Symmetry: D2
Subunit: 355 residues, 4 copies
């Protein structure tokens, strides 16, 4: 239903950075720099440019002061300068609004194309970026909870099949998804860079940004983030985890920034770069699909997500999902989940796992 354009898709390398509008620049700086340990590439009174430990492009996160907290741009890096032209021609044919700046929208990025995509998300495509010192061996700066890479975005959208087809035509490959036996798709994960994903689609009212995810080297680094949050007595900002994912097989943690933007810390998924990488489909009632250890998913994780902006800086209107709700079918009043397929023992009726 989103048609495949005749124009070639641009060659997208990876997710590269997010621009997030925040309301109190000092509080957010404290969260992202003081608590999480991200590295400042540039800052002034309006913006903070932050990067992970192993990054060499200018930034992975731009915090921009504004009146309404929201995603302003989710940016992917393309292979060549000519891929920014291809992106522009591709989104024109799709009838999408686009805006092209030879000198970039944020500091440290050159020629860039921003678009309101067919799902209502603000995508940016760019090649040119100002290189900075790669801190990958600066173990003199390395913190016990060090965030090493930007890994993915996760987007909330009402119709997952619709979005999936569009991203596949754009060159993303589905690695895992969640479905039921009645034809509904609840979520899908897709990649360009050869990890489990660069973005993911989560079925719900949208467009909204569910989260932005950063990686650590090891599982103990994620444990340390939790421990530090307890020491700072902000354990209430730990939403969910730590855990092992079923889908993706990664060790994880979800935390909430001062504007409630959700950040995931993630480590140790697997290689997906082969073009016939086997796709894995989970059943929506399988209680090990989201947390492998069967720990319950808190309802806020399903219902809460960040607003997104259009190209003019106004909030995108939210469209309701009419397909079945992952929350309702697993943990709501008429919900169901199993530990072992076909086994009544270890199954949950009308409530979440673990009592």
């Amino acid at each position: 239903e989103i048609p495949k354009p005749v124009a070639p898709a641009p060659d997208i390398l990876r997710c590269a950075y997010a621009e997030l509008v925040v309301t109190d620049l000092a509080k957010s700086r404290n969260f992202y720099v003081d608590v999480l340990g991200l590295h400042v590439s540039y800052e002034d009174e309006n913006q903070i440019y932050l990067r992970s430990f192993e990054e060499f492009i200018h930034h992975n996160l731009v915090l921009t002061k504004g009146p309404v907290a929201a995603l302003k741009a989710m940016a992917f890096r393309v292979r060549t300068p000519e891929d920014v032209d291809k992106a522009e021609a591709y989104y024109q044919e799709l009838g999408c609004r686009t805006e092209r700046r030879k000198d970039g929208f944020v500091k440290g990025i050159g020629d860039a194309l921003r678009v309101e995509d067919p799902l209502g998300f603000p995508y940016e495509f760019f090649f040119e970026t100002t290189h900075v010192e790669r801190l990958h061996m600066r173990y003199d700066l390395y913190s016990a909870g060090e965030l090493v890479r930007l890994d993915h975005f996760n987007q909330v959208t009402p119709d997952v099949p619709r979005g999936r087809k569009y991203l596949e035509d754009l060159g993303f490959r589905v690695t895992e998804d969640i479905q039921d036996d009645e034809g509904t798709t609840y979520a899908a994960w897709m990649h360009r860079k050869g990890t489990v994903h660069d973005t993911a689609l989560t079925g719900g009212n949208g467009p909204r940004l569910h989260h932005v995810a950063f990686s650590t080297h090891e599982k103990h680094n994620i444990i340390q983030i939790c421990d530090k949050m307890g020491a700072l007595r902000i354990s209430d900002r730990i939403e969910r985890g730590p855990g092992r994912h079923g889908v993706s097989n990664a060790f994880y943690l979800y935390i909430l920034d001062p504007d409630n933007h959700r950040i995931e810390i993630y480590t140790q998924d697997y290689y997906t770069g082969d073009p016939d990488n086997p796709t894995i489909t989970w059943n929506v009632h399988d209680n090990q699909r989201r947390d492998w250890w069967g720990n319950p998913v808190v309802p806020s994780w399903y219902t809460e997500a960040s607003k997104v902006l259009d190209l003019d800086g106004n909030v995108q209107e939210i469209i309701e999902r009419t397909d079945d709700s992952e929350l309702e079918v697993t943990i709501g009043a008429d919900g169901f989940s199993f530990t072992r397929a076909g086994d009544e023992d270890g199954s949950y009726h009308g409530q979440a796992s673990k009592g």
Copy 2:
């Protein structure tokens, strides 16, 4: 009100083993050997004797086939052979029922005393044990989830101060506890060997055994146990965790065996050996006391625990706690907890966290 005997206390070194009655020996073996990777010191059709990676005494766990799943004995090693005689005289003065077997109750233990202690728990005291190969450097046998030591027991009892004074007289020292402003004690941790505890008292209906705990080297070993349980599709047997404890500061996991005996896997508490080791008291309403990260404690963790047997092998009758319930005052309908004292942001009312 448990009187201090004039007879000297036995010198207790550490918690050493538990004997657990199980209903299906083969299923239990599958859990303790095939899933958890404990090492077989002896087995036959009626019992399995198991030990941890770094142990040199005969065993840390005995699984005995019986009709009713229950704790049959929680055993402490004493410093000398004479300490068994001291234990006998001590418990006889307390008016407790005792039984002395010069050749032991279980294989690989020699002269031993079992008692029905004043809290109704079956304690064993012994010195003599058959030494076995210490597997501490057998990395050829080392599992990704390796259990390296027995760390502690945790006992459910209705009146914590009563039990705590009795254990102090036995030479245990309290390291941490949970209290409220009204003066109720909900739990206490106490030690002999210089870790946070060898046993602990949890307020509730008892005598019941809350859990037995084993230690791993590192946090990743606990993660692996969870991961393996997912792979075996037995994640419903993960009860609580993994987490960081507030009390003890240890990384932890609670799992349930086939008869619902609860096992804790535990690592990285701190040294308590100095006699003036500072005691830490947590408020019962502090949401970081049990899980430092503020994760909720599932009601089953407070309400479910194992039966204990008397010396004849019958189940000990339960006495109901009359002091306030930690479940009720934190997560029950009129309960509450906080992240930051005095702050309504991050506080939970009539409701658990997260």
Copy 3:
């Protein structure tokens, strides 16, 4: 010196497997399966097919019984069936010997091309492969030392710039290298899959295969491999490490199989997938370039490597390196190394670091 063909290079995805010839199959099986924990895809009296924990292709290593221990093939997977045709045309234009087998050289691989490449190495290109159970969440099988992926090969060749140009034309990008101030290149690392490398060139007499590398999830997994080797009283088979590499930033260990084939265990390098990824050049006299902690590199690491076979299965003749020797210029009698550039303190003259000399 090696010309760029007019024919397009095949689109290479990644290193996929190696076929090693071994002299005693049962001894090699004990090393790779019982010691290292690799998973058996297939075996018989003549071959063992092994894979890592996260692999879905049929195998990452084939051990083949033969009279002379050697590398028989280093195989790269290509993106499409049509890329195998491209590889054939490309290598024919380079004037190399090639062999095409529609149903594969080894079990579990389909249409495959093997070539004697311009550096004398037996390369294989394939697309078609039998998928198997991907064991990535089989934590009921996971060992304390689990090998999760095949990561790279490392090749010994006498002229590194000559090979580097050829691999760049083939589509590999150099991520790191080691050079001196007098124009000599000692080593280069190059990738297709977006890690530090899929293969590497190490200057020395060749063609010889230096090692094959597998990855683990965490550093403690590499430690456990060492610990287990101690417990099995085969610590004499730990060649070098564990350590932190300067080049690649990975945590590492080198061990030796029963035929002296060198295996590296490797973890936690960085992403190189961007086309303008910064190339890092280390100076050969920098004592943190190979081991970041400054531990000395054992001389066998520089001198010993496995024979490689031609398409007929005969050993390839060795061509001697005439460029300067990394061993000689760093830890040899006229050698030099530094800890801090320009500082005499922490420098080493005619001997290795940490109080050692060449045996």
Copy 4:
């Protein structure tokens, strides 16, 4: 031939702190605070008092500015105030020089006794100490290389059985030792607190202090210390390691402070608190006894150690070892070591393991 006194031994709990004389207080501070991350309890122009992450007594390390770098005191905490009096009577009966200060020798310690012990070492015994904030849950301060406890001292002394007998009479129990088949003892480990050791005796010219050891929680913490030293371009101050010890089974690293005082970082030894804890004797030629992975012991580890002071602040005279040297019998020109006892394969004669000889 150090007699057992009639007077009762003091009840020693554990090693508690060391007082090290250092020549440049600012440079030592950069090392212990900025590099290693210890926590400051008190400092001024003359001294810096440091503690580990889990400590509640005032300090584990006192750095005292002075003219000659040396160990000034190795302090053990005793169980009660009365035990300081027992210590005094005990050493007086041995005929040792003692000095008692009711208000301590350093800040944060109360009634204390220093003695010049029969091996020439300056020992302090105390009970009273100023309690400080226990930082064990201050994960807001926790570094990637955090030192969590003080674990042990290691002493160099010419006659190990003489020293061992004396420590046994003080209540220390031997856990492990190294010997040869002809009855020479090279080293012994002994404990009070239920870990492998609180102090250890290493055969050599002495009295000298070999090292002070701190523990970390996990192996990755020790790896981070190396990684950080590499980043700071002070890898030349990594003496030996990281490794796994044979004796003790601990993961370890040895580093050198600005005055060449050796610090060990140590983790994951085993419980020894039972009175019949099985002792383990290793053969001196076993190449897995010091490093379980067979990595060679750097010669400086055998030859270099810190001076110790007498109670007036003067350096103690050094007495030479007349028994065999561990260095000489294992890695010297006439030395040997084995991987498997009796097996020539994996054995080393006249040189160290892994292909190095002595520099």
